[PDB]
Amino acid sequence: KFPRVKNWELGSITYDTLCAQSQQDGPCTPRRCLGSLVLPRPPAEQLLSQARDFINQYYSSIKRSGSQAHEERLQEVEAEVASTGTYHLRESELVFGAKQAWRNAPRCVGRIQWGKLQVFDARDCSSAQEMFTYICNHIKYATNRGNLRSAITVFPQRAPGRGDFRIWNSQLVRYAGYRQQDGSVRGDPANVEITELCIQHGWTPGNGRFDVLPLLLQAPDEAPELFVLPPELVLEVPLEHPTLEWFAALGLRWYALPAVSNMLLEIGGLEFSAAPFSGWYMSTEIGTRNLCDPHRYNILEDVAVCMDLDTRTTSSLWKDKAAVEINLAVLHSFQLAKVTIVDHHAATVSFMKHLDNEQKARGGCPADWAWIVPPISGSLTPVFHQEMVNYILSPAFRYQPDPW
Amino acid sequence: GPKFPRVKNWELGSITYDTLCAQSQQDGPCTPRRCLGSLVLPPAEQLLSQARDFINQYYSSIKRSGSQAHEERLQEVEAEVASTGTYHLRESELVFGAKQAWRNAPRCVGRIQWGKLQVFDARDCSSAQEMFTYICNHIKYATNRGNLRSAITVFPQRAPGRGDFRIWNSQLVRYAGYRQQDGSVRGDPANVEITELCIQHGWTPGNGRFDVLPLLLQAPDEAPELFVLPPELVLEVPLEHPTLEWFAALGLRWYALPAVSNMLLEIGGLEFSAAPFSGWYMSTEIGTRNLCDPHRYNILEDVAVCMDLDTRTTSSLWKDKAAVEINLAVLHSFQLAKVTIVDHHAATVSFMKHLDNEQKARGGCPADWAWIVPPISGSLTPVFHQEMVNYILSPAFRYQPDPW
Numbered sequence: 001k002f003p004r005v006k007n008w009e010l011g012s013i014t015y016d017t018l019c020a021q022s023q024q025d026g027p028c029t030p031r032r033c034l035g036s037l038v039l040p041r042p043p044a045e046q047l048l049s050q051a052r053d054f055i056n057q058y059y060s061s062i063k064r065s066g067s068q069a070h071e072e073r074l075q076e077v078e079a080e081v082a083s084t085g086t087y088h089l090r091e092s093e094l095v096f097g098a099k100q101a102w103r104n105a106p107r108c109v110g111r112i113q114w115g116k117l118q119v120f121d122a123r124d125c126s127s128a129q130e131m132f133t134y135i136c137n138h139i140k141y142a143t144n145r146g147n148l149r150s151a152i153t154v155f156p157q158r159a160p161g162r163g164d165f166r167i168w169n170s171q172l173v174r175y176a177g178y179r180q181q182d183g184s185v186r187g188d189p190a191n192v193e194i195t196e197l198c199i200q201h202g203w204t205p206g207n208g209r210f211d212v213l214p215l216l217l218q219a220p221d222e223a224p225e226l227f228v229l230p231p232e233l234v235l236e237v238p239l240e241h242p243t244l245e246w247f248a249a250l251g252l253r254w255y256a257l258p259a260v261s262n263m264l265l266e267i268g269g270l271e272f273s274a275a276p277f278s279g280w281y282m283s284t285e286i287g288t289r290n291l292c293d294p295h296r297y298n299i300l301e302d303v304a305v306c307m308d309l310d311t312r313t314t315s316s317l318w319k320d321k322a323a324v325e326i327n328l329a330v331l332h333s334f335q336l337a338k339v340t341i342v343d344h345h346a347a348t349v350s351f352m353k354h355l356d357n358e359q360k361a362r363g364g365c366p367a368d369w370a371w372i373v374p375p376i377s378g379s380l381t382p383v384f385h386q387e388m389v390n391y392i393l394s395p396a397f398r399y400q401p402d403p404w
Numbered sequence: 405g406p407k408f409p410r411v412k413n414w415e416l417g418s419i420t421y422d423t424l425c426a427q428s429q430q431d432g433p434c435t436p437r438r439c440l441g442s443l444v445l446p447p448a449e450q451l452l453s454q455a456r457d458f459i460n461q462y463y464s465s466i467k468r469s470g471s472q473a474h475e476e477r478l479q480e481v482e483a484e485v486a487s488t489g490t491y492h493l494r495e496s497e498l499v500f501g502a503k504q505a506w507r508n509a510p511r512c513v514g515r516i517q518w519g520k521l522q523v524f525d526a527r528d529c530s531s532a533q534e535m536f537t538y539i540c541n542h543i544k545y546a547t548n549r550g551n552l553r554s555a556i557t558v559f560p561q562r563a564p565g566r567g568d569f570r571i572w573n574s575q576l577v578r579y580a581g582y583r584q585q586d587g588s589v590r591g592d593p594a595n596v597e598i599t600e601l602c603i604q605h606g607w608t609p610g611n612g613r614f615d616v617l618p619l620l621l622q623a624p625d626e627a628p629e630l631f632v633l634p635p636e637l638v639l640e641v642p643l644e645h646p647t648l649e650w651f652a653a654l655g656l657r658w659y660a661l662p663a664v665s666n667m668l669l670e671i672g673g674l675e676f677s678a679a680p681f682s683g684w685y686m687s688t689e690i691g692t693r694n695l696c697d698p699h700r701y702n703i704l705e706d707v708a709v710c711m712d713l714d715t716r717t718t719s720s721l722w723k724d725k726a727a728v729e730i731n732l733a734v735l736h737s738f739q740l741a742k743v744t745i746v747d748h749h750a751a752t753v754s755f756m757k758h759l760d761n762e763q764k765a766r767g768g769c770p771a772d773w774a775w776i777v778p779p780i781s782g783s784l785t786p787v788f789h790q791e792m793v794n795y796i797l798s799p800a801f802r803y804q805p806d807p808w
């Protein structure tokens with residue numbers, strides 16, 4: 001049953017025994033693999049057993065498995081679920097759970113950092129106003145003048161009687177997308193809809209290519225509220241190129257802080273609908289995907305023309321050439337601005353080490369090959385050559401529907 | 405909606421559903437518990453129903469399903485199995501099954517060409533010497549002085565209590581890999597074992613980085629015989645760069661004809677253990693994988709030193725720059741020598757067109773995302789953004805164990 005896992009550069013072999021701890025089904029069956037889809041489409045005893053498993057994971061982590069603290073905490077959980085149909089985590093438990101959700105995230109290549117996570121307990125939040133304050137602290141902390149620090153802030157869990165705490169934005173920092181008369185988009189095409197929502201709720205919009213969006217924050221069962229981030233909290237990096245003087249004239253820039261804000265955090269069967277987290281960028285996210293994706297800023301052609309490349313044929317490799325300069329520009333500019341960035345070689349090399357650490361520690365690591373391999377120069381990185389097993393462990397981050 | 409996998413393109417936002425996967429009669433490696441999609445390698449009762457399915461497929465494809473000739477062919481197939489334990493394909497059935505196997509191959513991006521395949525029937529072949537003649541005709545035909553033509557030569561099928569026809573080499577044309585006195589390898593490190601098997605069977609070896617290997621050909625129940633390809637038959641392309649003048653001095657080269665020779669061709673339960681097939685190259689196969697893989701020629705550093713890059717640090721993207729030029733050199737040299745090649749941009753754009761063709765014709769196309777997406781410039785190609793469903797259809801090419 002246990003899958004044999006080979007690295008093809010090195011000829012080495014491991015066996016994933018960790019996958020036996022999965023309690024949640026992915027999208028594949030023996031008839032067909034759907035491993036490449038991005039998104040595929042409680043009652044007391046089910047919660048109670050997810051809770052026990054997690055409490056068990058927690059006492060294992062602190063080497064107190066079977067002790068008196070462990071025993072009585074299980075009793076406390078059974079007592080609370082039996083009476084109320086739910087329960088609550090202690091702060092240390094939450095801290096362990098948040099790190100473990102990151103650790104378990106098959107699509108994250110930055111997991112060597114997993115144990116280094118500042119966890120802000122925001123479960124004593126009763127308003128969108130308070131959410132904003134908490135969010136501003138997270139950003140201030142996480143940014144740290146360019147010396148970025150991984151952080152998560154956790155707002156109040158879901159409850160059966162009421163609506164969720166939610167952040168409408170998919171990240172804490174995002175650029176606006178304005179549909180134009182002419183049918184094109186100024187700004188980021190990925191954010192057209194959230195830009196339109198911000199306007200609908202009273203935002204006076206800019207008209208630039210990089211207008212930081214405001215936040216729509218939603219307390220249970222209320223209209224979302226609009227909050228503009230103080231601009232001094234939002235660190236941005238102007239993009240120049242080491243050798244190409246003209247590159248700066250493109251006026252391209254990106255924000256320092258990658259911070260997901262619409263994923264659900266699940267710990268011990270409890271669900272945290274608003275729990276934004278941030279780390280630091282790997283350069284290809286910006287250099288390749290955000291700037292060069294055809295459904296994003298789509299700047300490749302512009303850059304190739306600047307580079308006076310032959311755009312008439314594909315075989316001149318003008319796309320590859322321009323894409324490299326752009327990734328180079330992102331790395332250079334971040335390093336110049338003294339803002340933390342990792343390149344895809346450094347990142348994937350450290351992910352290989354993480355795979356080795358996890359093998360010894362846990363007997364495996366869930367990993368999504370298509371997400372782990374970078375979007376340029378795939379086979380030039382060691383992860384390309386590494387077979388990977390993908391499965392869902394809890395604690396987990398999940399996707400959740402947009403609240404509108 | 406529909407109870408078949410929903411399949412999304414993220415560049416375009418368009419949706420399809422795959423209904424072809426319903427036809428799959430063979431389980432892959434994945435289960436709901438865990439996806440294994442990134443793994444490289446993972447009596448008469450059974451034969452007769454496979455045969456029936458194939459005959460049904462043939463008859464549907466010529467629009468004569470349910471007809472008297474369809475039923476008589478079914479009856480003829482049953483009788484032949486009933487008395488001999490096996491059966492035999494009519495000529496046009498083999499032609500159809502061979503193309504269908506190419507059409508069904510999830511790992512091939514060149515499938516838009518599937519309808520154009522020269523099928524050479526070599527089911528009369530009765531010795532190792534004749535296999536050689538057949539193979540020489542294939543190479544001459546397929547090479548066509550650089551205007552390459554897809555072809556497959558089919559030798560006799562596995563028999564009950566009778567040895568297989570086998571080609572021992574993994575491709576018709578491959579370079580030697582000589583294990584050096586100091587652990588390192590001269591030539592292609594992927595070919596150490598086969599090289600050593602050639603020497604063991606009486607080949608006098610060269611001392612070069614690019615020595616074309618001899619063929620080890622095995623008739624049923626006989627030891628393999630060694631055959632040297634006449635060099636006038638093996639078209640090679642010396643590698644040079646359009647602007648970097650020193651690149652020619654590296655003395656790199658590659659062969660024109662990519663020809664898989666150790667795969668099993670399965671058709672209606674019949675097994676063709678010797679059925680070598682060939683197409684033409686996608687440039688990344690040579691420029692990226694064969695030349696730059698750490699476990700192949702590993703020339704990235706050498707080229708980056710020539711290009712005067714900073715190889716002491718990852719963030720100079722020296723690997724990415726050198727890789728781009730090596731690929732460009734491959735494209736340019738093949739073009740100069742008038743030998744067919746396709747770049748990873750054109751290949752993938754044409755594979756997208758193939759997915760549309762197949763949606764309309766069969767209701768889907770089995771595709772292995774990890775293999776379809778090229779090893780450089782991944783997200784710059786349209787296939788990165790296209791979700792794919794992977795499943796096994798028959799007729800098929802299979803991996804098979806090495807005969808020794």
Ligand code: HEM
Pocket residue numbers: 098102105107108109110111113117150151152277278279280281282285342347371397
């Ligand atoms: C510390 C530096 C970090 C780096 C360099 C990093 C890198 C990455 C990259 C490149 C991806 C793929 C992103 C994409 O292509 O959309 C990713 C995904 C992800 N990361 Fe990390 N990450 C870091 C920190 C974190 C932290 C702190 C967390 C949570 C505590 C986290 C959780 C996730 C999750 C849940 C995904 C999947 C996102 C999705 O499926 O939409 N990462 N990361």
Ligand code: HEM
Pocket residue numbers: 502505506509511512513514515517521554555556681682683684685686689746751775801
């Ligand atoms: C016409 C030009 C063709 C092109 C451009 C092409 C392209 C490719 C590429 C890039 C791969 C992946 C190779 C690798 O990374 O190892 C591949 C795999 C494959 N191709 Fe095609 N191909 C062509 C013709 C053919 C033909 C004629 C056949 C057989 C009838 C074929 C059958 C296959 C099969 C079975 C694989 C899987 C190989 C494996 O798993 O080892 N292709 N093709």
Ligand SMILES: Cc1cc(N)nc(C[C@@H]2CNC[C@H]2OCCNCCc2cccc(F)c2)c1
Pocket residue numbers: 038110170171258259260277278279280281282285
């Ligand atoms: C925490 C962290 C570190 C890092 N280096 N980089 C990141 C980028 C995030 C993750 N992944 C993209 C970025 O976030 C973008 C917003 N995510 C929305 C969810 C989503 C998902 C799929 C398809 C969709 F249409 C929408 C996060």
Ligand SMILES: Cc1cc(N)nc(C[C@@H]2CNC[C@H]2OCCNCCc2cccc(F)c2)c1
Pocket residue numbers: 444514574575662663664681682683684685686689803
């Ligand atoms: C027909 C055709 C067209 C084309 N453009 N390109 C090709 C390259 C073939 C396919 N794929 C690599 C090349 O052939 C190499 C032979 N591979 C043996 C099987 C194998 C599998 C995994 C790991 C291994 F070590 C060995 C064929």
Ligand SMILES: C[C@H](O)[C@H](O)[C@H]1CNc2nc(N)[nH]c(=O)c2N1
Pocket residue numbers: 036037038370371372414788789790791792
């Ligand atoms: C269809 C395909 O799964 C999709 O384009 C994925 C591929 N791999 C990825 N890998 C990362 N890191 N991020 C992505 O957005 C994607 N997109």
Ligand SMILES: C[C@H](O)[C@H](O)[C@H]1CNc2nc(N)[nH]c(=O)c2N1
Pocket residue numbers: 008384385386387388442443444774775776
């Ligand atoms: C581990 C991974 O499956 C392996 O390195 C695969 C990835 N994709 C590939 N894709 C192609 N076309 N050829 C290959 O050899 C590989 N190698």
Ligand SMILES: [Zn+2]
Pocket residue numbers: 028032033034035434438439440441
């Ligand atoms: Zn799968």
